[PDB]
Design an enzyme around this catalytic site. Structure first.
Site, PDB file in Angstrom:
ATOM      1  N   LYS A  47      -9.655  26.766 -13.380  1.00  0.00           N
ATOM      2  CA  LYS A  47      -8.624  27.365 -12.545  1.00  0.00           C
ATOM      3  C   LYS A  47      -7.962  26.357 -11.615  1.00  0.00           C
ATOM      4  O   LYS A  47      -6.816  26.581 -11.201  1.00  0.00           O
ATOM      5  CB  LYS A  47      -9.215  28.524 -11.746  1.00  0.00           C
ATOM      6  CG  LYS A  47      -9.645  29.704 -12.606  1.00  0.00           C
ATOM      7  CD  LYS A  47      -8.470  30.286 -13.377  1.00  0.00           C
ATOM      8  CE  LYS A  47      -8.885  31.517 -14.162  1.00  0.00           C
ATOM      9  NZ  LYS A  47      -9.961  31.195 -15.135  1.00  0.00           N
TER      10      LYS A  47
HETATM   11  C1  LIG Z   1     -10.010  32.676 -15.690  1.00  0.00           C
HETATM   12  C2  LIG Z   1     -11.303  32.401 -16.455  1.00  0.00           C
HETATM   13  C3  LIG Z   1     -11.353  32.497 -17.810  1.00  0.00           C
HETATM   14  C4  LIG Z   1     -10.119  32.886 -18.622  1.00  0.00           C
HETATM   15  O1  LIG Z   1      -9.097  31.949 -18.455  1.00  0.00           O
HETATM   16  P1  LIG Z   1      -7.575  32.464 -18.714  1.00  0.00           P
HETATM   17  O2  LIG Z   1      -6.566  31.512 -18.121  1.00  0.00           O
HETATM   18  O3  LIG Z   1      -7.644  33.780 -17.944  1.00  0.00           O
HETATM   19  O4  LIG Z   1      -7.318  32.703 -20.183  1.00  0.00           O
HETATM   20  C5  LIG Z   1     -12.541  32.248 -18.475  1.00  0.00           C
HETATM   21  N1  LIG Z   1     -13.650  31.912 -17.783  1.00  0.00           N
HETATM   22  C6  LIG Z   1     -13.601  31.811 -16.438  1.00  0.00           C
HETATM   23  C7  LIG Z   1     -14.856  31.429 -15.664  1.00  0.00           C
HETATM   24  C8  LIG Z   1     -12.418  32.060 -15.763  1.00  0.00           C
HETATM   25  O5  LIG Z   1     -12.372  31.961 -14.366  1.00  0.00           O
END
Ligand SMILES: *Cc1c(COP(=O)(O)O)cnc(C)c1O
Ligand code: HEM
Length: 488
Positions: free
Chosen positions: A74
């Protein structure tokens, strides 16, 4: 509305785009001006033991996003969105960033706000996840709590109240990872490019889980533009409607993937296939990544691995597959990393260490005998009276039930003292305000080894009757276990 349809006019191999383009975040070879410039450029590591143990002939490479400086993938979007906002003049010094997420995006935005001197406010109800609270408080973020029962439709939910708080706070902003082009664009511009270069142009399948669809859609658009034959696979857990094949919504332990709505940033036209996953296989696969591959990662990583292993059975030897590992073990240290937590949820079987115990290990709780505590009704007992009762109680917990059969909530001395000190609950108020709606409940038919294992952390366990309507039976503590073991 995060579930609104997308207005994006992009089609495959389109030229002129309104969005910004960020190629590289920073240069590791010389001194970097801030930690944010270190986001990205994560290694692509080969899986050696795991695929060959499963008989997979082709290659499987994991892109490790747990090595970002914030600890998750993120970071990439938390930077990007902010960056784009700053180029639109929306972000000024002294601005307060509000985001409606309890996931890693809040940590990314908290870190970036710490670097840029922005106030950060995160809204999540109750505890959905923990040990992230310590990290958010360490980064200078304010955490606002809401009712955990409210659906995202309800105004009491974190999204709606996040918008209300945005209206209350002057000159604030919500980046809204669900509607923000920066979320998929960060992976379109950087993640997918890193994967493409590292693979030296040879890549066949890409497996990733979609909470928001940002990762899978950005990497799917870029990689499908560079390599038209690539197959893009999305991973969704059971209990989420993100799969175009769905039906109800359930409750799963794995964090970060799936939602009860369809985000705007998720483009399902670039998804070739969806794979559904369960908590058990996913979390045991994440522990499998840690143990066999030495990769410290989270549950969503395990979900990705299981999906890829399901698809890769018949894939020929010369193909390459790439799976995304979104985050690391840091948040999960007490949940899927802990053998206790795994055995509690039933994802692992408690092992009997001493053979002397072999006789009572598989015996049911039914063989035990313990007090059935009277279930108090709603809005009756004042806290003074409940201080008295908790002092006199056998297991030192109180039971509140509206139906006289099923247990609605519990009263503990810690929660009561917290609410009395904080002022939430006056002395002559009702204890139902301090009631704890979440608590540990075990079927009457469970084995005594399971109970004794659970009791090492939880001092009390509520026993419910599996045969009749999860009816309240009694409370079990380690006193009953010792009393059954010693007196044989
Ligand atoms: C946000 C997230 C995902 C999914 O990523 P996307 O951008 O939503 O496709 C998977 N695992 C974790 C730990 C996340 O925070
Ligand atoms: C030539 C390429 C592209 C074109 C012509 C294009 C076009 C557009 C336009 C005009 C908008 C404005 C929406 C509005 O005004 O409401 C938009 C929004 C958006 N774009 Fe693109 N885009 C392109 C590339 C991309 C890429 C590569 C991504 C992701 C990897 C992306 C993701 C988004 C998203 C999520 C939105 C938000 C939609 C909304 O707010 O309703 N776009 N796009």
């Amino acid at each position: 509305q995060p579930n609104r349809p997308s207005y994006c006019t992009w089609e495959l191999n389109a030229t002129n785009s309104p969005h910004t383009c960020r190629t590289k975040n920073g240069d590791y070879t010389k001194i970097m001006p801030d930690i944010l410039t270190a986001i990205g450029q994560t290694p692509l590591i080969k899986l050696n033991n795991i695929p060959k143990s499963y008989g997979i002939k082709c290659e499987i490479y994991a892109k490790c996003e747990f090595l970002n400086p914030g600890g998750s993938v993120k970071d990439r979007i938390a930077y990007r969105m902010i960056q784009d906002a700053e180029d639109k003049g929306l972000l000024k010094p002294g601005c307060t960033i509000i985001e409606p997420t309890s996931g890693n995006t809040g940590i990314g935005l908290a870190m970036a706000a710490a670097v840029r001197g922005y106030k950060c406010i995160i809204v999540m109800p109750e505890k959905m996840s923990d040990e992230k609270i310590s990290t958010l408080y360490a980064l200078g973020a304010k955490i606002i709590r809401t009712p955990t029962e409210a659906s995202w439709h309800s105004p009491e939910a974190h999204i709606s109240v996040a918008q209300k708080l945005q209206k209350e706070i002057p000159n604030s902003i919500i980046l809204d990872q669900y509607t923000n082009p920066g979320n998929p664009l960060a992976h379109y511009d950087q993640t997918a490019i890193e994967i493409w270069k590292q693979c030296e142009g040879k890549i066949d399948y890409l497996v990733a889980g979609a909470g928001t669809g940002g990762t899978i859609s950005g990497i799917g658009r870029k990689l499908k533009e560079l390599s038209p034959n690539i197959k893009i696979i999305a991973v969704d857990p059971k209990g989420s409607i993100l799969d175009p094949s769905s039906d109800e919504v359930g409750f799963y332990e794995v964090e970060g993937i799936g939602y009860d709505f369809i985000p705007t940033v998720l483009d399902r036209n670039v998804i070739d296939k969806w794979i559904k996953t369960e908590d058990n296989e996913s979390l045991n696969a994440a522990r499998m990544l840690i143990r066999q591959e030495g990769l410290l990662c989270g549950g969503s990583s395990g979900a990705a691995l299981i999906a890829a292993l399901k698809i890769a059975k018949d894939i020929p030897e010369e193909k390459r597959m790439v799976i995304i590992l979104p985050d690391g073990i840091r948040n999960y240290l007490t949940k899927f990393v802990s053998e206790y937590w795994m055995e509690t949820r039933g994802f692992l079987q408690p092992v009997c260490q001493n053979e002397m115990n072999k006789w009572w290990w598989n015996m049911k709780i039914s063989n035990l005998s313990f007090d059935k505590q009277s279930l108090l009704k709603e809005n009756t007992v004042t806290c003074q009276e409940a201080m008295h009762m908790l002092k006199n109680a056998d297991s030192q917990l109180l039971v509140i039930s509206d139906d006289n059969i099923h247990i609605k909530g519990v009263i503990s001395l810690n929660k009561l003292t917290s609410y009395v000190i904080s002022g939430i609950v006056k002395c002559t108020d009702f204890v139902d305000k301090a009631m704890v709606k979440q608590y540990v409940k075990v079927k009457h038919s469970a084995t005594l080894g399971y109970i004794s294992r659970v009791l090492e952390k939880e001092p009390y366990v509520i026993i419910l009757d599996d045969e009749h309507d999860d009816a309240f039976i009694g409370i079990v503590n380690q006193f009953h276990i010792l009393q059954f073991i010693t007196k044989n």
